[PDB]
């Protein structure tokens, strides 16, 4: 409950404003939002848990760590 | 000793309809039930259960049993 991110709220994507595109997963939700757990009810894909290693940017974006690889 | 105790097919053939049967059995059951609720005023128009009766029972089962035995009859006005 603490970590969940909700797209529903004031000045945002409401229940009836939902579409096919927003709900589905995106190639960018990798290490920033787990694609598996979401409510399986009508509000499918409008709620999502934060990734395991996720972190917040001061602006409000989500970052993820990556190990640095050099010369193979 | 069950809801399906009288097989339906015999009832259907005598009645000729799946709806005429229910209306006719229900009218007979109403008459029997009101007779059992007479409590002694003894109206002559009412009649008792033709077939023997248990100490506890529902009038509709007795009605359907009479239909299967065929002792009753119906006549549309």
């Amino acid at each position: 409950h603490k970590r969940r991110l909700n797209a529903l709220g004031p000045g945002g994507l409401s229940r009836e404003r939902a579409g096919f595109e927003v709900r589905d997963v995106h190639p960018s939700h990798y290490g920033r939002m787990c694609p598996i757990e979401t409510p399986e009810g009508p509000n499918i894909g409008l709620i999502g848990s934060l990734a395991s290693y996720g972190r917040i940017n001061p602006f409000g974006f989500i970052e993820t760590p990556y190990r640095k690889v050099v010369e193979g | 000793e069950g809801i399906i105790n009288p097989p339906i097919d015999e009832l259907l053939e005598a009645t000729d309809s799946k709806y005429s049967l229910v209306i006719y059995a229900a009218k007979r059951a109403r008459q029997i039930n009101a007779y059992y609720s007479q409590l002694g005023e003894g109206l002559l128009e009412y009649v008792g259960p033709l077939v023997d009766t248990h100490v506890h029972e529902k009038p509709l089962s007795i009605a359907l049993r009479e239909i299967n035995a065929g002792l009753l009859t119906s006549e549309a006005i």
């Binding site: - | 069950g2 809801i3 506890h56 029972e57 529902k58 509709l60 089962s61």
Partner: protein, 48 residues
């Protein structure tokens, strides 16, 4: 007294979506301990 009185009296079981007319079906009741209805497997697929 309850076990005596329920018999030869049909009760209509029904499921919520009730897509087609097999959604509501009559049964002859029967007492049983616990707090969960018991239903006949064969008719289960008709209700979905």
């Amino acid at each position: 007294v309850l076990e005596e009185v329920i018999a030869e009296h049909p009760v209509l079981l029904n499921r919520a979506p009730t897509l087609h007319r097999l959604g509501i079906q009559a049964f002859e009741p029967q007492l049983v301990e616990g707090k969960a209805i018991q239903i006949h497997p064969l008719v289960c697929t008709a209700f979905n």
